[PDB]
Amino acid sequence: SNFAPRPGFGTLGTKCIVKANHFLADLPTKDLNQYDVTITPEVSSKSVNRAIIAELVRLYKESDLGRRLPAYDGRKSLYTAGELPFTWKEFSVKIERSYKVAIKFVARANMHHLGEFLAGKRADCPQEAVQILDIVLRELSVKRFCPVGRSFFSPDIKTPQRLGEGLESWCGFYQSIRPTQMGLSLNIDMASAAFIEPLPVIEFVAQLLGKDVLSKPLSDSDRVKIKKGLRGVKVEVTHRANVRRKYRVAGLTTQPTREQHTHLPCLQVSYLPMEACKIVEGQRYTKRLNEKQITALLKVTCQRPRDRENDILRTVQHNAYDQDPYAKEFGMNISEKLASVEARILPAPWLKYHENGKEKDCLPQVGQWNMMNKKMINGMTVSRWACVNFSRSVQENVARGFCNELGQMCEVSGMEFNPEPVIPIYSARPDQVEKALKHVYHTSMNKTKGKELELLLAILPDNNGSLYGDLKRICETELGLISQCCLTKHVFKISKQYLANVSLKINVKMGGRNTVLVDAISCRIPLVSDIPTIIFGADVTHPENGEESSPSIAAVVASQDWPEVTKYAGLVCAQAHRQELIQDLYKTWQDPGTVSGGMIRDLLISFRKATGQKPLRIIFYRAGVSEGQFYQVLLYELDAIRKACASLEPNYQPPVTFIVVQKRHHTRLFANNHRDKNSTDRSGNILPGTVVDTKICHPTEFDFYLCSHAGIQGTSRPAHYHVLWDENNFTADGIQSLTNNLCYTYARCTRSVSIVPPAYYAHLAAFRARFYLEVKPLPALKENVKRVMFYC
RNA sequence: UGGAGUGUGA
Ligand SMILES: [Mg+2]
């Protein structure tokens, strides 16, 4: 069947007005038609095909096209308002390479279907009409800019400037039409991406290396880095007077020119000298940025909400959609004002802390609170602990003092940290991590009469490198320990807030919890606390662009303690490259008969063992989907859940509520009045816990926008929750309030988070599991670690 | 790796 229809509109919270970045578009009625494109020989170059089509149009616009102006998608589809006076005619295009183009009328799209879908009278989205409108709107943007997909950004509009290590950053908008509740919306939003500067090869190499290589040949690592950076760069020769030929470069010779600047190897297309070549403008940097040039872009793309709103308004008026021939002929009419969306600021929930404290309750003012005069619900009275000093700057006395300070902070925050460790702290070196870990574990087990450790405070260096991952992998797949790796800078500079955050982390890293909603304690949460429910969360973390070697990791967590649900236990796996499903939610093989598996079954069994009873309802929070596979993901990951529940106990099919969360979109909400105190306590974003479900949401399906976090800088992007499946029959107010309330139960922070802790923990587990691989099956987690939040 | 929050809808 189709998705879950929207049951209604929310009412809770104080009314307020925000401004979205969606611009109303009025659909035309011109009987738009699509004409197929066939070019022989076949070339997969979108720019070349577009140029060929443009030349064909210029040649034969008044010949047999009837003065009708086509709109070409770029690869295979051509759209024209009305109907051309011909059906199947072929035109020859000579660029002098010659091409043969075949054009045939395919079918006629229906704008009335788009109107019916936007009016809420059906549930099927006319992808054809939406794509035709998008392409006819973006023809002029493609012509005037450099397309990178749905974003057309070019220089001389924001003065692109230096980024770091050669490549720079460009600025511009992101345009994508979308069918919303109020009608078609042009989702214009500012965007930026990295570009390679048109610099000579010598200058670019010097900037990337940050030094001079006039007389120093490159090392193996330097050569590998140069090849990785330069793989896929177009360069043009400049030594010739009037030969503007281009030579794509992917391989570099291993020998110098003599075997000018002939010492260094010359690029191979013969052997093109690297001293008389220039990088072609417009190239895009692949892979991912480094830690130094990511922040340089962050200082560019991170601007105030008012500045971003003004930039979007300026960009929309700069395109002038009311003047371009494509939209004038096609009947398009785009507005130039931000939608005045009404919102609702949901109230913050009451948090209950331990009775043994001055403050037994807390009301988060602006989405963040403090632990002063409060104690955790559950201390864990850690008794056995040890420390490893993987650093040389810090001394034994300094490390012992840091441990004592952390313990005192834990005790005053509500723990019972042991004053003295099992074994005296000793300093090792960051290369013998395995030997140090086995030595510490074996010594601790030899002492304390064969009782395992409960914690391991590790002071690893600032830029350790290949050390944190190895340490965590060994401790969580070969030893079975719990570690609290810290950095040397914070050990040297002790701050009470840092100690409190570390205490909050190590409380939940050893069982128990530190804060609970009063509604959860009082068994008063709508449609949750009435009967036991297990709240799941999934996330699939794909590797860095082209990384076939490394597989993709999927993680699934689930709440484990009922009456005050805060404790999530998760499992991880490794599946095929760039796979958008989770093949390990259920697995059946032959073993004498057919023993089952998967993560759903294991987590349900763990929940049953932990709380004494099987869960009665399920609330699934999926993440990491790309909007192109909702149907497939829902079908597979709901059939897997049903089969896992059936296999565990017969006739056990609890209701499920499949909700997909994703923050990767370009829907921004701005404060209606920037001169008023209705925004965050800073000079920035809108108030936390504000819900939007009108005028920018799906016309018929069930979704909402929730900005539950207090943005610290830049324009905070609210999360998007889409309820694909709903068997509990959640009301709009109930689901919005529940999702907002969970955001206040994050273990590691004393603030409200943007996405739900289920999905956030699933993402953290998936990101952490990348350190375990060293083949399709990941190493098995130890049995003393899977029951505790090792990832937090 | 104290933490939340800021850049890509494959
Ligand atoms: Mg994720």
Side-chain angles (χ1 to χ4, degrees), chain A residues 422-443:
Chain A
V422 174
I423 60 150
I425 66 174
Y426 78 98
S427 193
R429 46 171 72 95
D431 56 27
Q432 53 188 61
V433 55
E434 314 97 5
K435 314 322 161 313
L437 285 181
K438 324 212 171 293
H439 181 68
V440 163
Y441 197 59
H442 282 47
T443 317

Side-chain angles (χ1 to χ4, degrees), chain A residues 460-507:
Chain A
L460 54 82
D462 273 305
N463 204 47
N464 49 3
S466 83
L467 176 54
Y468 166 81
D470 212 346
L471 176 59
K472 295 297 187 179
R473 161 165 50 82
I474 298 156
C475 280
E476 306 182 331
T477 47
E478 296 146 31
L479 280 193
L481 270 157
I482 289 284
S483 60
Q484 193 42 55
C485 312
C486 295
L487 291 177
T488 309
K489 50 181 180 162
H490 300 309
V491 176
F492 272 123
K493 186 261 295 178
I494 276 165
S495 65
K496 306 287 198 333
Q497 321 211 359
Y498 162 77
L499 297 178
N501 283 133
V502 174
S503 160
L504 261 57
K505 271 171 63 69
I506 80 180
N507 185 15

Side-chain angles (χ1 to χ4, degrees), chain A residues 146-165:
Chain A
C146 295
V148 185
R150 318 183 93 176
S151 63
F152 318 103
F153 61 92
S154 85
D156 82 17
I157 67 169
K158 275 272 271 203
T159 313
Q161 63 84 30
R162 284 281 311 91
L163 208 62
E165 288 165 74

Side-chain angles (χ1 to χ4, degrees), chain A residues 209 211 213 217-227:
Chain A
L209 293 161
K211 63 176 194 179
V213 290
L218 288 187
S219 86
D220 271 335
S221 165
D222 291 279
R223 198 135 42 240
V224 166
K225 177 178 66 86
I226 289 293
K227 279 318 279 171

Side-chain angles (χ1 to χ4, degrees), chain A residues 187-198:
Chain A
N187 193 74
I188 293 279
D189 180 28
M190 298 304 290
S192 84
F195 268 62
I196 307 188
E197 293 179 353

Side-chain angles (χ1 to χ4, degrees), chain A residues 538-541 623-624 759 762-763 766:
Chain A
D539 191 61
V540 183
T541 300
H763 158 53

Side-chain angles (χ1 to χ4, degrees), chain A residues 259-384:
Chain A
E259 285 163 44
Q260 296 299 322
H261 294 325
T262 77
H263 42 273
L264 277 188
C266 284
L267 298 160
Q268 198 170 29
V269 306
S270 307
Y271 314 127
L272 275 190
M274 70 77 88
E275 53 90 19
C277 288
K278 188 73 67 68
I279 292 190
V280 187
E281 170 66 289
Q283 299 276 311
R284 275 211 73 257
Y285 185 64
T286 79
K287 300 321 289 203
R288 298 234 290 172
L289 294 174
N290 59 59
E291 286 321 298
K292 185 34 53 163
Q293 75 200 2
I294 183 183
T295 79
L297 177 66
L298 266 176
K299 274 79 72 177
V300 176
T301 183
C302 175
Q303 55 186 353
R304 303 188 28 79
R306 197 197 289 102
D307 300 2
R308 191 168 265 235
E309 173 167 62
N310 279 11
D311 269 20
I312 286 158
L313 268 177
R314 188 270 299 164
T315 295
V316 176
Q317 304 169 359
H318 183 306
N319 298 156
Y321 309 97
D322 303 318
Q323 313 303 20
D324 64 2
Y326 301 77
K328 291 177 71 68
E329 183 203 19
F330 266 84
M332 281 335 297
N333 169 66
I334 316 291
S335 159
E336 294 175 358
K337 274 153 61 93
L338 304 151
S340 294
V341 188
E342 70 279 52
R344 275 174 311 121
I345 310 171
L346 285 187
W350 274 92
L351 303 157
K352 177 150 186 45
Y353 285 96
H354 207 253
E355 271 286 322
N356 302 150
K358 264 312 311 183
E359 283 194 24
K360 298 159 255 282
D361 268 328
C362 191
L363 186 56
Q365 280 315 309
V366 192
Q368 60 171 355
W369 63 103
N370 58 348
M371 271 285 258
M372 291 295 298
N373 310 90
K374 307 172 189 36
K375 295 204 191 305
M376 321 174 183
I377 301 299
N378 286 11
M380 291 315 288
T381 177
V382 64
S383 313
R384 281 88 66 191

Side-chain angles (χ1 to χ4, degrees), chain A residues 38 115 131 283 335 367 425 456 513 522 551 594 603 613-614 619 665 695 705 739 779 788:
Chain A
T38 292
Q131 195 49 57
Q283 299 276 311
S335 159
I425 66 174
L456 189 139
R513 55 191 94 78
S522 311
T594 72
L603 290 182
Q613 52 204 356
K614 37 163 69 166
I619 295 171
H665 55 51
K695 272 178 70 171
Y705 287 94
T739 294
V788 177

